[PDB]
DNA sequence: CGCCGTGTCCCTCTCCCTATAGGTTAGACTTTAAGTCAATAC
DNA sequence: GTATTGACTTAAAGTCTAACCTATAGGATACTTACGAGAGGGACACGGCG
């Protein structure tokens, strides 16, 4: 909400996003950091016993 | 691939002049009711006095 | 059906050029004033917005 | 409601394993800007090139063919010249000179 | 005029010229600056005339202040070519240039697809003629009769009617109202349809397989002839050059290899692709 | 005489014609890559 | 059937010439100003206290 003012004052502040919420990870299309996306479950090594 | 236009005269961005609170106004301590008179060629300003 | 042909005519619409739009429409215009009796049916209105 | 960009997509497969050899040329503007253009090998090199900046640049190689640019199309002086004469304008210049003389010292 | 002559004469006398007398030097500097002053004054005087002539060309094509500025440019051109010895009011001569400049800038700067001025003039003439025929004749002008009045061919009239069409926006009505931008209901014929790509790759692999099942070097001559690896076909001269042979043998090889691929075992796994 | 709160209001966001000069293309001529046949040898 | 050469004809193209577009200029009597609410924030006025 209020895209213009947020965008312009973020541009002034040079505010760097860190891409760690559940929305900015949806906007850019990479895997979200919740559920099956976090590194605890996303990096499981599976070998036959 | 993007392009660009080389303007023959400098122009001001609208987001930093018109959107309240005006950012040019706060940076320069100028009132928007008067900043509009400047940037739309309605009133002079002094850029340097000796 | 022929009834829909008859009822598309004889229809009063409060929206259009020179009238209020749905976003400009308040709640108080959408009620049934007691002066509708015999001049405008309080039953038949579209169920949507 | 169909539509097209007035273009055509070719379903060709990339062949980076061999391309035609490409030479590289260095062009330079007047204000010290450098630009690299990978021109075709079996092709002519135009010394005067329109570069990425937008102004006309020349090759760093020394050729300088000097295409003999055109004179200004028409001046105010050309337009007055064709509708009057030199001595008429000299008379008017004398008139204004003696006018400001008679204004200044009386 | 005196100031322009004076600046010409200093420019002439500057080159290889004179150590000018101080009073003469200073005062035709004054003359040269005053020529520009008087010019400037004349343009300021007749800007309102420019506005008055441009006020009637609004409501179509361009904005208002754009037309004002083209009129101002025409005014600079008019004060550049104004002669006073003919003894005429300045407005009479200047109106000519103002109208010319305004109509030119309207012609070649008021369409998204730029139509050159001659075709703009013929389009405007056709529009005026069809308008007057609609007003007077009443009966809607048929294209061939418009050609007869136009003294051109009917197909030229049809091409003119096609050229005049101006572009709509992609952000207008969905079908009737502006609920959704129209650009959200236009397909893309220039796009990967995602069955063509996979079908095309499968065709590639199957054609390579059938070519491999053919004979040795002759299937490859077919491959070079239709350019399946180099991307360009090359001719019998080049195939002979790379192999050290003649051209009639190449054509015989082409015909022999071509005969077998018409036979069903090679064609049955290839026919469905065409 | 010199500065500070409260109030009101404005604004923004959300649900003609002519004349000259120059570039473009279309159209035909001669050359070349291309398709063709006839005899032949292994 | 598969390896050739020597003519023998044929469809597809670089270059010169002509017309048809294209950028450009010019064209004198005198004309001179169009045609709903609902909330938050900021700026301008007015009055109160030391």
UniProtKB/Swiss-Prot annotation, chain B:
Subunit description: The RNAP catalytic core consists of 2 alpha, 1 beta, 1 beta' and 1 omega subunit. When a sigma factor is associated with the core the holoenzyme is formed, which can initiate transcription.
Organism: Mycobacterium bovis (strain ATCC BAA-935 / AF2122/97)
Family in the record: Belongs to the RNA polymerase beta' chain family.
Species lineage: Bacteria, Bacillati, Actinomycetota, Actinomycetes, Mycobacteriales
Protein name (database record): DNA-directed RNA polymerase subunit beta'
Superkingdom of source: Bacteria
Function: DNA-dependent RNA polymerase catalyzes the transcription of DNA into RNA using the four ribonucleoside triphosphates as substrates.
UniProtKB/Swiss-Prot annotation, chain C:
Recorded superkingdom: Bacteria
Function: DNA-dependent RNA polymerase catalyzes the transcription of DNA into RNA using the four ribonucleoside triphosphates as substrates.
Assembly and oligomerization: The RNAP catalytic core consists of 2 alpha, 1 beta, 1 beta' and 1 omega subunit. When a sigma factor is associated with the core the holoenzyme is formed, which can initiate transcription.
Family the entry assigns: Belongs to the RNA polymerase beta chain family.
Name under which the protein is recorded: DNA-directed RNA polymerase subunit beta
Organism expressing this protein natively: Mycobacterium tuberculosis (strain ATCC 25177 / H37Ra)
Curated annotation (Swiss-Prot), chain D:
Keywords for this protein: Transcription, Transcription regulation
UniProt GO MF annotations: bacterial-type RNA polymerase core enzyme binding
Coiled coil spans: none
Single GO BP term: positive regulation of DNA-templated transcription
InterPro entries: RbpA_sf, RNApol-bd_RbpA
Functional note: Binds to RNA polymerase (RNAP), stimulating transcription from principal, but not alternative sigma factor promoters.
Family of this protein: Belongs to the RNA polymerase-binding protein RbpA family.
Subunit comment: Forms a complex with the RNAP catalytic core and with free principal sigma factors.
Protein name: RNA polymerase-binding protein RbpA
Organism this protein belongs to: Mycobacterium tuberculosis (strain CDC 1551 / Oshkosh)
Gene: rbpA
UniProtKB/Swiss-Prot annotation, chain E:
Record bears the keyword Transmembrane helix: no
Subcellular location: Cytoplasm
Domain of life according to the entry: Bacteria
Stretch list, region Sigma-70 factor domain-2: 42-112
A GO BP entry: DNA-templated transcription initiation
Ranges annotated as DNA-binding: 236-255
One Gene Ontology MF term: DNA binding
UniProt keyword terms in alphabetical order: Cytoplasm, DNA-binding, Sigma factor, Transcription, Transcription regulation
Region Sigma-70 factor domain-4, annotated ranges: 210-263
Region (Sigma-70 factor domain-3): 121-197
Gene Ontology CC entries for this record: cytoplasm
Keyword Acetylation among record annotations: no
Primary location: cytoplasm
Short motif Interaction with polymerase core subunit RpoC, span: 66-69
Assembly and binders: Interacts transiently with the RNA polymerase catalytic core.
Free-text function comment from the UniProt entry: Sigma factors are initiation factors that promote the attachment of RNA polymerase to specific initiation sites and are then released. This sigma factor is the primary sigma factor during exponential growth.
Family that this chain belongs to: Belongs to the sigma-70 factor family. RpoD/SigA subfamily.
Name under which the protein is recorded: RNA polymerase sigma factor SigA
Residues of the full protein shown: 254 to 527 of 528
């Amino acid at each position: 909400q209020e895209t213009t003012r947020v965008l312009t004052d973020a541009a002034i502040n040079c505010r760097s996003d860190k891409l760690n919420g559940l929305k900015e990870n949806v906007i850019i299309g990479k895997l979200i950091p919740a559920g099956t996306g976090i590194n605890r479950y996303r990096n499981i090594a599976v070998q036959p016993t | 691939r993007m392009g660009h236009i080389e303007l023959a005269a400098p122009v001001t961005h609208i987001w930093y002049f018109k959107g309240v609170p005006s950012r040019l106004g706060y940076l320069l301590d100028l009132a928007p009711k008067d900043l509009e008179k400047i940037i739309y060629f309605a009133a002079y300003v002094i850029t340097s006095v000796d | 059906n022929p009834l829909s042909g008859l009822t598309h005519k004889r229809r009063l619409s409060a929206l259009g050029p020179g009238g209020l739009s749905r976003e400009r429409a308040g709640l108080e215009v959408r009620d049934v004033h007691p002066s509708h009796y015999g001049r405008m049916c309080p039953i038949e209105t579209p169920e949507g917005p | 409601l169909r539509g097209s960009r007035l273009g055509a997509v070719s379903y060709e497969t990339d062949r980076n394993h061999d391309l035609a050899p490409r030479q590289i040329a260095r062009y330079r503007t007047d204000n010290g800007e450098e630009f690299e253009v990978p021109f075709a090998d079996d092709a002519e090199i135009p010394g005067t090139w329109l570069c990425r900046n937008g102004m006309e640049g020349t090759l760093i190689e020394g050729d300088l063919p000097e295409p003999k640019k055109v004179k200004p199309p028409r001046t105010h002086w050309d337009m007055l010249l064709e509708r009057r004469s030199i001595e008429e304008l000299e008379e008017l210049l004398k008139e204004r000179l003696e006018l400001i003389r008679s204004r200044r010292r009386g | 005029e005196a100031g322009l002559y004076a600046t010409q004469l200093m420019t002439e006398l500057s080159e290889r010229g004179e150590k000018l007398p101080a009073a003469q030097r200073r005062d035709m500097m004054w003359i040269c600056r005053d020529g520009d002053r008087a010019k400037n004054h004349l343009l300021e005087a007749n800007l309102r005339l420019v506005v008055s002539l441009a006020k009637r060309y609004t409501g179509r094509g361009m904005a208002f202040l754009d037309l004002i500025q083209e009129g101002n440019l025409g005014l600079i051109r008019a004060v550049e070519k104004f002669d006073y010895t003919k003894g005429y009011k300045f407005s009479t001569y200047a109106t000519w240039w103002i109208r010319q400049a305004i109509t030119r800038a309207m012609a070649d700067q008021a369409r998204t697809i730029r139509i050159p001025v001659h075709m703009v003039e013929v389009i405007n003439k056709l529009g005026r003629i069809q308008r007057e025929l609609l007003q007077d004749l009443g009966r809607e002008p048929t294209p061939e009769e418009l050609a007869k009045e136009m003294d051109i061919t009917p197909e030229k009239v049809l091409e003119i009617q096609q050229y005049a069409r101006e572009p709509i926006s992609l952000d207008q009505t969905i079908g009737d109202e502006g609920d959704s931008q129209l650009g959200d209901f236009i397909e893309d014929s220039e796009a990967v349809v995602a069955v063509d790509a996979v079908s095309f790759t499968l065709l590639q692999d199957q054609l390579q397989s059938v070519l491999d099942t053919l004979s040795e070097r002759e299937a490859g001559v077919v491959r070079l002839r239709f350019g399946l690896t180099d991307g360009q076909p090359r001719t019998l001269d080049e195939i002979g050059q790379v192999y050290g042979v003649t051209r009639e043998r190449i054509r015989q090889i082409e015909s022999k290899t071509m005969s077998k691929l018409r036979h069903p075992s090679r064609s049955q796994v290839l026919r469905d692709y065409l």
